[PDB]
């Protein structure tokens, strides 16, 4: 990753601006989860025997930019690389998959369509989460999933084009909270090194 270069171990949930960049570090505590801020966009997590835990940089609030991210992500079990976020009123959790690794985290939904977009097919699927961790404390929201049917790990994110895509298969989206290139893991380890330019 950022070698030398990295902050200082972050091992329990925190959300600060390091180098212009928002980061999101929420872990329920299980395992060891260890959380780095690098230069710029960079962040890095290293995980082992984890529970639930998602981390990364991006912008507070999100404004539907198109997001370029690059680096590696080296899960050992059960991991998501996405662009992760949150609408309040009302309240939204919303992945854009771009891999995962062995969990579909879109299991337990009818899929509602699919949107093409950097050069990839995103199925589409809407869930709920009942007496659940939020941006708001323990609440009951709307999931809303872009997963991409060709795993990959970099490339150009155009959030508008997911945005439209679940507003045009009826699913409503709030005023926007955080926007970040998360790694995500449950019950796994492994590590994950990434840069949003
Ligand atoms: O202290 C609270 C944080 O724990 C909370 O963090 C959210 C919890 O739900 C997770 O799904 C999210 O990823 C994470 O941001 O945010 C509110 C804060 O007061
Ligand atoms: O409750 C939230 C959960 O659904 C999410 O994906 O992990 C972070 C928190
Ligand atoms: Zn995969
Ligand atoms: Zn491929």
Known sequence: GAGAGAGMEITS?????????????????GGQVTYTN???????VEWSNSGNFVAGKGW??????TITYSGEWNPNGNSYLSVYGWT???????????????????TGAQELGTVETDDGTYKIYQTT?????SIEGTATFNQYW??????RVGGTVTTQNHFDAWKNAGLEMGTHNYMIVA?????????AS????
Do not use: C, K, M
């Open 194 to 197: 990434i840069t949003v330019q």
């Open 60 to 65: 507070n609030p999100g404004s539907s930019q």
């Open 88 to 106: 309040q009123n009302p309240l939204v959790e919303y992945y854009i998959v771009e891999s995962f690794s062995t969990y579909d985290p879109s």
């Open 38 to 44: 690098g230069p710029a966009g960079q962040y890095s």
């Open 183 to 191: 790694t995500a893991g449950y019950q796994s380890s492994g590590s």
């Open 129 to 133: 989460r009942e007496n659940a961790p």
């Open 146 to 151: 872009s997963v991409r049917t060709d795993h």
């Open 13 to 29: 949930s925190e959300t600060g601006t390091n180098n212009g960049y928002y980061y999101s570090f929420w872990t329920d505590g």
